[PDB]
Design a protein around this nucleic acid. Structure first.
Lengths: 58, 185, 222, 159, 51, 171
RNA sequence: GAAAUUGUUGAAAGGGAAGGGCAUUUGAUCAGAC
RNA sequence: GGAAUACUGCCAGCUGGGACUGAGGACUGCGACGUAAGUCAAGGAUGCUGGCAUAAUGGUUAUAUGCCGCCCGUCUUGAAA
RNA sequence: AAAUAUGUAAGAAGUCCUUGUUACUUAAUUGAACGUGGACAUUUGAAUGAAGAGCUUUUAGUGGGCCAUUUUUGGUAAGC
């Protein structure tokens, strides 16, 4: 016995009940997939500023 | 008819009138629903809402967080009030003198602050001292420390603690968990 | 502390001055409403007497009544109907005529009847069917203090002042119109004037822009 | 059977242009791309390395990481009931600076300038934008512009 | 407890509009306008009467 | 409905390059104000490169004719759509006013050729200033000298349902 | 000492089903209130 | 050349007839008229009068009349079938 | 080369000014990223609306569908 193959019917209407909103935007996004060479530099630069400010604000 | 823009007869989704049948907690709520109604102070709104909360939304505050709370700048004299339970931390060997307001102290905590020169009080005694919550601070215990939250949301590529009865080798540490044996996660 | 004639004499004095202030602005709007209504009349004579045509200012305000029921409406018109707060048949709302509002009106044309309303129509609507949105509650106006405590920020102090901000689209029309609850009208008293409603007004039906004939329609509804 | 490959149904989409085939001009490589730049993704059939999927043709994104010859782009993708974050790696041939952000920046300059000049006198410069308002009154005169009457025309076949 | 209507119930009308008393007593609803004797130009009349 | 004759004048919107447009005028027979403006935009788009959004209406003035009592005889030209083609036509209506002639024409077309309001163009309506310039017989008939005729078989309308004598149709 | 089912008496209706709903006329019966 | 009438629109213009409803239960509020007292149609009906005081109204039930009413449960895209 | 659809933006997480870090980069304190200090607040950056907003856990039924306008394929067609 044959049946229905595929329809998108009622699929969009289900999608708008709890709908399709943009999730969120956070500040300071993740660093996944960033050039490692710049990332090693970032840590060493980051530590230098933090330690320098710590000495100034001791 | 009406084209409703929102679901009809939706309850607030918030908890009021906590479902515990403890008579004494009801009296505390009654004192603070009157207080939040008639004082126009945001502190009594918080406590009344916090008196509603469930056990997992009242994680146990330890005396160490209280000590850290009092080591904040200009907070060593504020009254500490915990809507919940206070336990003992044998991991600290000093303690300040500050008084604490809470529902339940442990014997070790009750011994601790009393020994250190403090005095543990209830929430009503807080009301007759701080009707507007003067010189107080709310401490909330860590909610995400419970062993059930580790398991929440698990799927591929998020590392979220499978439900398991017996652990160790040969318990779901196999194909699916390594590249040597099939794919990994 | 007798407190039965000291503050009562104070509140009556504060009431009399408010009634006093309300009086001039009603008188003030009268010469303002008369003068403008006679300027366009007279500026038309000057154009004809000078061999020209006076093209009047394009209307800034429309009153919209939802004509169709709540069933079987495609997504886009249903959303635009909600954004104008017309969520049931025979509902009313004032819309400020602007490019960003004209394109909304085209999408909803098969479902609404609208036109340019006069002072008499708008004055009668608020007096009979004017409700203010008071803390997400539909409250009959029925007093000047109700508008005062809610629209007194923008200089609106009375039910007559509120009508003024509607007909002459002022800097605070958006808040004033939003405060006005959507009007719940009944069916027209003398009927719809046509055998079939859901054709355009130009095509012998009901929906679309009826430029001044909305006044006759709304008054039969009001 | 069915056939769903990477470049399925991309016949006209990656078709080059009319009278613009061949090697690409070097303004496309001289460009400089920062983290946080807003970019649009128009593919280039000639350059086969680093092409995007068909799903991202014309989609605008933002640069997160930059490499020797390519650029990483953050795209939000509608699947199911949600937006799943999508990261793409693209050579600079298939990426161009989105000009949509640009006219907002020039609006900021005037917006910042008008307030600065206004505060010298406090005139409520009204920095906001307005939509197209209904027209106001005017007088149209008929000196040498006397109306001419037009009538409907009869029928003719013209063939 | 009950919505009384202006446009009737004159007592309610005076409550919402202090100007209603002088609007009525002056008969501003049936006011007369001063007559003017301007007449349209000759070009207007011919255009209106044009075929 | 019952028709009214309006004059509608519109023009393209002025611009810096070409101000002072041509101010085209057209006479429209319509029931109300909104239809008269609409039919002007409908017909104008058929001649010139203009539409409602790209132009403005400057004026509308209803035209009521000079002699609502003198009986005229109007020659009317139209252009209407049949079920198979578009055809031109010319007829006369003899009546008291220009608008009543058009009101007769629309009913007349709807009765003989099933032409509804949408599928009819009124080309021009003119008075036949001279008798013996009439070319159709049905209006030429009434122009004889000392015209007179009876109205035989008059039917009275009865108010009551029952009549107590057989009605008579003398007249 | 139930129901299905049955007899007798009493009441009522019945032109190819009966039973039901809204409303009331008519007949029988009836509580409250004074 | 001077009027009128029509049509459209406005009046916080006047006024007659009919119908449904009387929720609320000390005052508070907003008003209106008055020099004042006070009064009111002003945050929801009161005053006068009549008949009966009983199955008269009303309930129940049976029947009659007007209109309407397909057999329940089940599988099912679809059931009086 | 339309129409209808479709992505992005319309600010405070913004803009502007000075200069601290670095193992990356540059001939070059040149840049890149992150910060320190200062200035710009209610017309704070289009419209309209917002019925509260954001988030989590768990679990049911369902996983045979069918019809209508418009688009459309196979078929002469079909209540296919």
């Amino acid at each position: 016995a044959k049946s229905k193959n595929h329809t998108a019917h009622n699929q969009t209407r289900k999608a708008h009940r709890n709908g399709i909103k943009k999730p969120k935007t956070y500040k300071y996004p993740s660093l996944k997939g960033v050039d490692p060479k710049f990332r090693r530099n970032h840590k060493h630069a980051l530590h230098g500023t933090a330690k320098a400010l710590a000495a100034a604000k001791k | 008819g009406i084209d409703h823009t929102s679901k009809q007869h939706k309850r607030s989704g918030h908890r009021t009138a906590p479902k515990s049948d403890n008579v004494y907690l009801k009296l505390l709520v009654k004192l603070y629903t009157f207080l939040a109604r008639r004082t126009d102070a945001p502190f009594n709104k918080v406590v009344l809402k916090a008196l509603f909360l469930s056990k997992i939304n009242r994680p146990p505050v330890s005396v160490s967080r209280i000590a850290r709370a009092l080591k904040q700048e200009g907070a060593a004299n504020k009254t500490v009030v915990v809507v919940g339970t206070v336990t003992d931390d044998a991991r600290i060997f000093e303690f300040p003198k500050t008084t604490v307001a809470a529902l339940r102290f442990t014997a070790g905590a009750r011994a601790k602050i009393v020994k250190a020169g403090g005095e543990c009080i209830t929430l009503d005694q807080l009301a007759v001292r701080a009707p507007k919550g003067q010189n107080t601070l709310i401490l909330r215990g860590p909610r995400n420390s419970r062993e059930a939250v580790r398991h929440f949301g698990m799927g591929p590529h998020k590392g979220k603690a499978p439900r398991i009865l017996s652990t160790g080798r040969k318990f779901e540490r196999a194909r699916g968990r390594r590249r040597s044996k099939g794919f990994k996660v | 502390a007798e407190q039965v004639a000291a503050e009562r004499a104070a509140r009556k004095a504060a009431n009399k001055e408010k009634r006093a202030i309300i009086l001039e602005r009603n008188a003030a709007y009268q010469k303002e409403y008369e003068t403008a209504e006679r300027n366009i009349i007279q500026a038309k004579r000057d154009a004809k007497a000078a061999g020209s045509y006076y093209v009047e200012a394009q209307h800034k305000l429309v009153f919209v009544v939802r004509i169709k029921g709540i069933n079987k409406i495609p997504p886009k018109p249903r959303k635009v109907l909600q954004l104008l707060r017309l969520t049931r048949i025979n509902s009313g709302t004032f819309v400020k005529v602007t490019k960003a509002t004209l394109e909304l009106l085209k999408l909803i044309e098969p479902y609404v009847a609208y036109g340019y309303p006069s002072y008499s129509t708008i004055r009668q609507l608020v007096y009979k069917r004017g409700f203010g949105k008071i803390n997400k509650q539909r409250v009959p106006l029925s007093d000047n203090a109700i508008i005062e405590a809610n629209l007194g920020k923008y200089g609106i102090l009375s039910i007559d002042d509120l009508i003024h901000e509607i007909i002459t689209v002022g800097p605070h029309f958006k808040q004033a119109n939003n405060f006005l609850w959507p009007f719940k009208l009944s069916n027209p008293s003398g009927g719809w004037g046509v055998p079939r409603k859901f054709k355009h007004f130009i095509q012998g039906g009901s929906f679309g822009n009826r430029e001044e004939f909305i006044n006759k329609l709304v008054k039969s509804m009001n | 059977g069915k056939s769903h490959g990477y470049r399925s149904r991309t016949r006209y989409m990656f078709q080059r242009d009319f009278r613009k085939h061949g090697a690409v001009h070097l303004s496309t490589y001289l460009k400089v791309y920062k983290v946080g730049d807003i970019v649009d993704i128009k593919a280039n059939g000639s350059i086969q390395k680093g092409m995007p999927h068909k799903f991202y043709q014309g989609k605008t994104g933002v640069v997160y990481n930059v490499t020797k010859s390519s650029v990483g782009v953050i795209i939000n993708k509608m699947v199911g009931n949600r937006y799943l974050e999508k990261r793409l790696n693209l050579r600079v041939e298939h990426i161009k600076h989105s000009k949509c952000r640009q006219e907002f920046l020039e609006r900021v300059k005037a917006n910042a300038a008008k307030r600065a000049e206004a505060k010298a006198q406090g005139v409520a410069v009204q920095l906001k934008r307005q939509p197209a308002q209904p027209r106001e009154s005017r007088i149209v005169s008929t000196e040498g512009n006397v109306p001419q009457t037009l009538a409907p025309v009869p029928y003719e076949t013209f063939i | 407890v009950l919505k009384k209507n202006p446009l009737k119930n004159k007592q309610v009308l005076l409550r919402l509009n202090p100007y209603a008393k002088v609007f009525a007593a002056e008969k501003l609803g049936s006011k007369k306008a001063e007559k003017t004797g301007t007449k349209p130009a000759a070009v207007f009349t011919e255009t209106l009467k044009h075929d | 409905a019952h028709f009214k004759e309006y004059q509608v004048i519109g023009r393209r919107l002025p611009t810096e390059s070409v101000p002072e447009p041509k101010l085209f005028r057209m006479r429209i027979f319509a029931s109300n104000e909104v239809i008269a403006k609409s039919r002007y935009w409908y017909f104008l788009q058929k001649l010139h490169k203009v539409k409602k959004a790209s132009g403005e209406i400057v004026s509308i003035n209803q035209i009521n004719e000079a002699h609502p009592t003198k009986v005229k005889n109007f020659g009317v030209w139209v252009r209407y759509d049949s079920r198979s083609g578009t055809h031109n036509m010319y007829k006369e209506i003899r009546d008291v006013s220009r608008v009543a002639a058009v009101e007769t024409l629309y009913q007349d077309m709807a009765a003989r050729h099933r032409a509804r309001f949408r599928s009819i163009h009124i080309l021009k309506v003119a008075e036949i200033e001279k008798t013996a310039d009439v070319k159709r017989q049905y209006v030429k008939q009434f122009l004889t000298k000392d015209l007179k005729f009876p109205l035989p078989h008059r039917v009275q309308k009865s108010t009551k349902t029952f009549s107590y004598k057989r009605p008579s149709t003398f007249y």
